[PDB]
Design a protein around this ligand. Structure first.
Ligand SMILES: O=C1NCC/C=C/CCC[C@@H](C(=O)NCc2ccccc2)C(=O)Cc2c(Cl)c(O)cc(O)c21
Ligand SMILES: O=C1NCC/C=C/CCC[C@@H](C(=O)NCc2ccccc2)C(=O)Cc2c(Cl)c(O)cc(O)c21
Lengths: 211, 211
């Protein structure tokens, strides 16, 4: 099952290198950005369902779900939002609040403004050196978008991951010095601090040994 | 991706109908049987690794993991044991401690003896009317074995489930009147009662809303 490869627009590669290498000390804000994007995608599928309730049937429950996978150094953020088709994955993450945000950064803006420029997605490279976006839109098959902060990304039909009824999984491959965010206490703390007003249940998946 | 279909040996179909329809009141013993089978598979991969440690590299951690999926009425029991190939799935579950166990039942034996006759796997039909066995052996690709208590089962190359490094997932589709076993308290209780001496960590995956 072959993967297709695509090149990032110049201003994206720049931003991503301008973030994976940063020594900025408030790295935890990535989670607010991802939760926000999730909330948005949920809003869209819900708004859409107003004039077509059948859209919900692929996944009746509207939720945000966070799943640490410590043994893999992975953190997953899932939502049952509207999702993205193959074309949307290729196009959407391929533009500029970018150049303008980079300019604000140069002038001393705090990285946390990133979401204001509509490019908060890339805040994930604060804690991760690699990401897979797994997405299922009602209008397409499930696909995997993958990037390692480099200049190119891949898109591949998904034949290896669990079936999403509908929506998106952000699978973050955390940096060796950020395993921090695999911990339940740490995670809940970050959520309480920046995501107080979310209209959708935020679920935490925790694995505990029975003793 | 086509599924292959196979017919059960006569004495298996019988046993399975002789269990899905039973009014036996101590249904919880299914979990002990499945945990035991898991422990066995872990023993085997560990014993095997004695003369070939590389066998462990597909999944270094040896564990039993229980994951309720309430919204799907599903309970999953996973282990990182030795797993089963396509041929093993077709053959292994296709024989008789069977006929002998059925005879013991007719005479008044308790269903809990089932494991003594080497057919404890089928105790799952006490709480489930459908099961998928998802398995990954180091020697084959990942496959799905599926049965609905009928006379035939299917085997299909797995292109829809999460990747198992190595081992087996029993995915139980619980009966409407047995959702019971999706609850953390209920589950831990059953484990403590019948699986005190398990050499491997038994993990429980619990999903909780952040509030
Ligand atoms: O699935 C998602 N969005 C719903 C469809 C609407 C998209 C509108 C524009 C925002 C969207 C986006 O930036 N997509 C481009 C993109 C494509 C591939 C990878 C990353 C980003 C977008 O936010 C994609 C997205 C992200 Cl980044 C997320 O963390 C969670 C999500 O549910 C989604
Ligand atoms: O993967 C498993 N076993 C390791 C390989 C050794 C098998 C030895 C014989 C027991 C085995 C078995 O009954 N297999 C036949 C079978 C084939 C297909 C579906 C169900 C059962 C067997 O117990 C398969 C098995 C079950 Cl049922 C389970 O609940 C958990 C498991 O890890 C395994």
């Amino acid at each position: 099952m072959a993967s297709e490869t695509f090149e990032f627009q110049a201003e994206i590669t720049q931003l991503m290198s301008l973030i994976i290498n940063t020594v900025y000390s408030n790295k935890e804000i990535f989670l607010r950005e991802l939760i926000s994007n999730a909330s948005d995608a949920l809003d869209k599928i819900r708004y859409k369902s107003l004039s077509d309730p059948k859209q919900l049937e692929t996944e009746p429950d509207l939720f945000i779900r966070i799943t640490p996978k410590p043994e893999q150094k992975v953190l997953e953020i899932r939502d049952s939002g509207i999702g993205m088709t193959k074309a949307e994955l290729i196009n959407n993450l391929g533009k500029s609040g970018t150049k303008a945000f980079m300019e604000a950064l140069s002038a001393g803006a705090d990285v946390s403004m990133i979401g204001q420029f509509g490019v908060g997605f890339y805040s994930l490279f604060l804690v991760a050196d690699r990401v897979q976006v797994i997405s299922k839109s009602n209008d397409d098959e499930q696909y995997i978008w993958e990037s390692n902060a480099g200049g190119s990304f891949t898109v591949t039909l998904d034949e290896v991951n669990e079936r999403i009824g509908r929506g998106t999984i952000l699978r973050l491959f955390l940096k060796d010095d950020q395993l921090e965010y695999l911990e339940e206490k740490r995670i809940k703390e970050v959520i309480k601090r920046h995501s107080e007003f979310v209209a959708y249940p935020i679920q935490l998946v925790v694995t505990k040994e029975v003793e």
